[PDB]
Amino acid sequence: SFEAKPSGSVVECDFSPLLSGTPPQVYNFKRLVFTNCNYNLTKL
Amino acid sequence: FSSRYVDLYGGNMFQFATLPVYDTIKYYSIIPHSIRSIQSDRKAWAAFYV
């Protein structure tokens, strides 16, 4: 089958807690949720 | 989760806010709340069901 050619292809998550404050122990590990924001894991 | 924000009339529930707690809570305890008033102005309130 033929396939149509693709054309016309169509805030800020903050990893601040990880770099701020004393790091927690593995049992007391700090967990955070990111939603509706643009993360930059590669930069981190 | 607050039902009123997504639809006051519907009664459907949506997650209004998120609070981050690492600890997992196993027990639920209800704190009784009482408002002092004069006998003439005494107020009766609907019970909440868990």
Side-chain angles (χ1 to χ4, degrees):
Chain A
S1 187
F2 242 109
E3 36 268 305
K5 188 181 309 178
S7 55
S9 185
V10 167
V11 181
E12 179 59 34
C13 299
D14 296 334
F15 311 89
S16 302
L18 205 162
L19 42 98
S20 64
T22 318
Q25 305 293 350
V26 292
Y27 53 107
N28 318 102
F29 69 113
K30 200 277 183 181
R31 28 176 54 261
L32 46 95
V33 179
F34 282 148
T35 215
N36 217 6
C37 50
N38 270 173
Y39 76 100
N40 256 10
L41 194 51
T42 156
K43 295 306 177 181
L44 184 79
Chain B
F1 287 69
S2 188
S3 161
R4 59 176 185 269
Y5 297 101
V6 50
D7 198 6
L8 192 70
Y9 310 107
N12 298 160
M13 228 177 312
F14 107 105
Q15 183 184 292
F16 179 63
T18 293
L19 213 154
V21 172
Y22 343 106
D23 191 18
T24 55
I25 275 69
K26 307 182 302 179
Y27 282 89
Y28 68 91
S29 46
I30 300 294
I31 7 172
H33 171 248
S34 180
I35 322 184
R36 50 181 47 92
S37 185
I38 44 183
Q39 292 186 0
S40 61
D41 291 1
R42 262 169 173 169
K43 331 239 71 184
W45 301 282
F48 73 90
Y49 316 100
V50 143

